[model samples]
Target: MKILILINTNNDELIKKIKKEVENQGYQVRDVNDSDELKKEMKKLAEEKNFEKILIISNDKQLLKEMLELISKLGYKVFLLLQDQDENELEEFKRKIESQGYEVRKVTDDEEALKIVREFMQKAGSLEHHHHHH
Candidate 1:
């Protein structure tokens, strides 16, 4: 699947880690550091590639809001990654985004993130086939 990862900080180490992890899972990774670039990338993806899922790796509220709006309009899956230890922010963010009709997950650790991704992949695969049988 085509996945886009957006990091709030310009930390090359973190970006490399995210890219390596997603690539290890056999996904095409598109990395963007700036939020404006991210918006443009989303538009391009919507028009050109028709990406099935987009995974974001930032905690910036504005960026998240922008993505939530774009994904809601384009109907793409968006995942927001935050430090799992921050329960308050995570809960609030989850509630806010969930109310807007998008899936929000706050992954505390790498294992948990992988679990969520696995579950999502399974559900997405089921939907893909079920829709075809209709």
Candidate 2:
């Protein structure tokens, strides 16, 4: 399974850690610096590969919303990495993204990131098996 990390923050430590953990699992990791690159790479991957999971390291709600709109039809499971500060609006934001046909969740720590990666691996395995079974 391929993983896309949309780099939109200055949190180099977190980004490095997540990338390390994901790569540690042997999954291909691609990082895009901005939404323009993200759109192009996402479309290319969708056509050429099994592009199922994306992690957005951003706190910009507006950018996230726009991204959700742009990629609504791409069928990616989005992971939004944000700091754990009280954002009364985060719930509302998640609802909107979810409504856009995205399974968006927040990953605040390495444990959750690893869990997500493992789950994606399992999902990919089952999908491949089912594809062959048919």
Candidate 3:
């Protein structure tokens, strides 16, 4: 699995540790620190896009809807939406997104967030392995 993560938060140290964890799981990670970098990387990743198995680590609210809209246009690809933000920062938006039949959950707990990401990576690896093998 390949992951493109953009930690918009100032607390880069925390995310760096998480990045190592993701890397340890063997997924190619393109960890960036800002929006422009993320945009450039996304372009380079066009050829490697795996709609159903992509994990976008971002706090960009607009990016969420934009991605989902693109997914719909590209014929729909289920993805894990981890937009973890401060309580109520995304209250209205998340509800709107979910009402439209999508998930945009918040994760304030570091351990919980890490676990979710780790599990997603594990699942992605197992699934890709199974798919590529047969």
Between 1 and 2, whose TM-score is larger? Answer: 1
lDDT on C-alpha atoms for all candidate structures: 0.56, 0.53, 0.52
True-structure lDDT of candidate 2? 0.53
Model 2 vs truth, CA RMSD:
4.5
- For residues 1-134, what per-residue lDDT tens digits would candidate 1 score against the true structure? 34443333224445456656665554455555578876787688678765454456554566656765776776664444444356786678678766865555666665555556555554555553455542
Q: Residue 123 of model 2: what lDDT?
A: 54
**Residue 87 lDDT in candidate 2:** 51
Q: Over the stretch 1-134, how does candidate 2's per-residue lDDT look in tens digits?
A: 44443333334565566667666554455555567765675567567775354455544555555655555555444444433334556466656655765445555565665566556555554553455542
Write one digit per residue (lDDT tens) for candidate 3, span 14-124: 466667777666655444546676666555556555633344555455654555564455443233534345646546666766677653445566666666666566656
Estimate the TM-score of every prediction: 0.66, 0.58, 0.62
TM-score of 3: 0.62
Query: Clashes in model 3: which pairs?
Result: none
Q: Which candidate, 1 or 3, has the higher lDDT?
A: 1
Q: List the residue pairs that clash in candidate 1.
A: none
Best by TM-score: 1
